[PDB]
Amino acid sequence: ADLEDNMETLNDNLKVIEKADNAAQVKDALTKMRAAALDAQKATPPKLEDKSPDSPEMHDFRHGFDILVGQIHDALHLANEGKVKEAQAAAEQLKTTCNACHQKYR
Amino acid sequence: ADLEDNMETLNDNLKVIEKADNAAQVKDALTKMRAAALDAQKATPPKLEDKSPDSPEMHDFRHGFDILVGQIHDALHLANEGKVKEAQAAAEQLKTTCNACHQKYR
Amino acid sequence: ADLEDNMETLNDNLKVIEKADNAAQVKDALTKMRAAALDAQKATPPKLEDKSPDSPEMHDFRHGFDILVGQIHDALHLANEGKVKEAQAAAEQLKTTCNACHQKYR
Numbered sequence: 001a002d003l004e005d006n007m008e009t010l011n012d013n014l015k016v017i018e019k020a021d022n023a024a025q026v027k028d029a030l031t032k033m034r035a036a037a038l039d040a041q042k043a044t045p046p047k048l049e050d051k052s053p054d055s056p057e058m059h060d061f062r063h064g065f066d067i068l069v070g071q072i073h074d075a076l077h078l079a080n081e082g083k084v085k086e087a088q089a090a091a092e093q094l095k096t097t098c099n100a101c102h103q104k105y106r
Numbered sequence: 107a108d109l110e111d112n113m114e115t116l117n118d119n120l121k122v123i124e125k126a127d128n129a130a131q132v133k134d135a136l137t138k139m140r141a142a143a144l145d146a147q148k149a150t151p152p153k154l155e156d157k158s159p160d161s162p163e164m165h166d167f168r169h170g171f172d173i174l175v176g177q178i179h180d181a182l183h184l185a186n187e188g189k190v191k192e193a194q195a196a197a198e199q200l201k202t203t204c205n206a207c208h209q210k211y212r
Numbered sequence: 213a214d215l216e217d218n219m220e221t222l223n224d225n226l227k228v229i230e231k232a233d234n235a236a237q238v239k240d241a242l243t244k245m246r247a248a249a250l251d252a253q254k255a256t257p258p259k260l261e262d263k264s265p266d267s268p269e270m271h272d273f274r275h276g277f278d279i280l281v282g283q284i285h286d287a288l289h290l291a292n293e294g295k296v297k298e299a300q301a302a303a304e305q306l307k308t309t310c311n312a313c314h315q316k317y318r
């Protein structure tokens with residue numbers, strides 16, 4: 001999928017979590033966020049159309065997604081153990097990664 | 107172990123999974139693939155004998171293994187929850203990482 | 213927290229594990245090591261005060277923590293499955309990461 005729909009997938013599933021009743025709703029959204037993250041990681045973003053895929057910026061751009069994926073996973077472990085509010089807490093924490101990549105590349 | 111035996115460990119365990127009966131067979135092979143991945147990640151590969159360990163290429167070379175290890179882990183979670191065919195599906199997906207590193211460094 | 217207290221958190225929890233009775237003691241320390249690792253990863257270390265945050269060295273410095281976090285996680289999985297001595301074995305293995313970052317940046 002395109003960078004922009006993956007960002008809507010990231011954004012949407014975030015709302016799904018912060019309002020979720022239960023663990024399965026959380027696990028499902030995190031699963032979907034992981035997929036989107038990983039697929040957005042393949043894209044070249046507007047701001048960086050002038051850079052080769054092995055530029056330092058494209059490298060750093062792809063690293064922002066590694067960080068998000070690691071976090072999602074840590075949230076997933078909490079979801080997997082039925083800890084729905086701390087899972088929700090994690091999901092909320094992801095924001096500072098979202099915003100760190102956005103400050104520099106969006 | 108040497109880069110080349112680790113690649114045979116990666117390759118072999120891949121066949122073990124795609125033909126596995128059960129979860130324990132999958133978990134075991136993934137465990138072994140993780141080990142080999144991590145050990146191959148220390149090696150300097152023929153194509154890159156002329157580069158320092160902190161060259162951008164050696165950096166990128168080691169990143170190909172981070173991606174594989176993350177994927178293996180995601181497959182492991184599926185194996186750990188008794189999902190043997192989707193675990194098998196994951197293991198198959200790893201191929202595009204194997205081949206992405208190979209296109210550029212093999 | 214500061215780089216140096218996070219390193220004491222890393223160091224302390226390591227002793228907690230290698231002497232632990234049970235899985236919950238291990239899971240708790242690993243959880244805390246993950247937190248500290250991730251927080252130390254934001255710091256700029258003395259040796260690198262003269263480098264921009266996107267220098268290759270600051271990049272490599274932050275990667276040393278990715279490796280530690282991945283390992284901690286692998287130890288956590290063992291802890292989570294009640295495997296207290298192999299969890300302890302993992303925790304001990306972390307040392308070569310600790311020391312690899314230290315050789316070059318401490």
Ligand code: HEM
Pocket residue numbers: 003004007008010011014045046047061062063064065068094095097098099101102105106
């Ligand atoms: C869960 C955390 C994240 C959320 C909730 C999120 C959400 C969004 C949203 C809603 C947009 C605008 C989409 C649109 O309507 O066009 C966007 C754009 C963007 N994001 Fe994210 N994002 C996240 C993580 C990241 C990360 C980690 C990176 C960098 C590694 C990143 C890089 C970008 C870029 C480059 C755009 C603009 C692309 C363009 O100009 O077409 N995002 N994000």
Ligand code: HEM
Pocket residue numbers: 109110113114116117120151152153167168169170171174200201203204205207208211212
């Ligand atoms: C599970 C995925 C992978 C599989 C199944 C796999 C399998 C193999 C096999 C069968 C070989 C030839 C071994 C021989 O008979 O000598 C090989 C070579 C090689 N692979 Fe992989 N590999 C994988 C992942 C990777 C990754 C991620 C990288 C890079 C990060 C990589 C880098 C290399 C290199 C450099 C060689 C050639 C080394 C030499 O010339 O001695 N491989 N791989």
Ligand code: HEM
Pocket residue numbers: 215216219220222223226257258259273274275276277280306307309310311313314317318
């Ligand atoms: C679990 C593994 C680790 C342990 C047990 C550990 C432990 C320690 C300890 C005890 C200190 C001295 C603290 C003090 O009394 O001031 C220290 C310093 C330091 N470590 Fe670690 N560490 C680990 C991992 C890492 C990693 C992965 C990195 C690099 C990525 C790193 C980078 C540094 C640096 C730069 C200092 C010195 C900071 C300064 O000069 O203020 N450490 N570590």
Ligand code: NI
Pocket residue numbers: 001002003039040
């Ligand atoms: Ni796509």
Ligand code: NI
Pocket residue numbers: 059063165169271275
């Ligand atoms: Ni990197």
Ligand code: NI
Pocket residue numbers: 073077179183285289
């Ligand atoms: Ni996990």
Ligand code: NI
Pocket residue numbers: 107108109145146
């Ligand atoms: Ni070896």
Ligand code: NI
Pocket residue numbers: 213214215251252
């Ligand atoms: Ni701090």
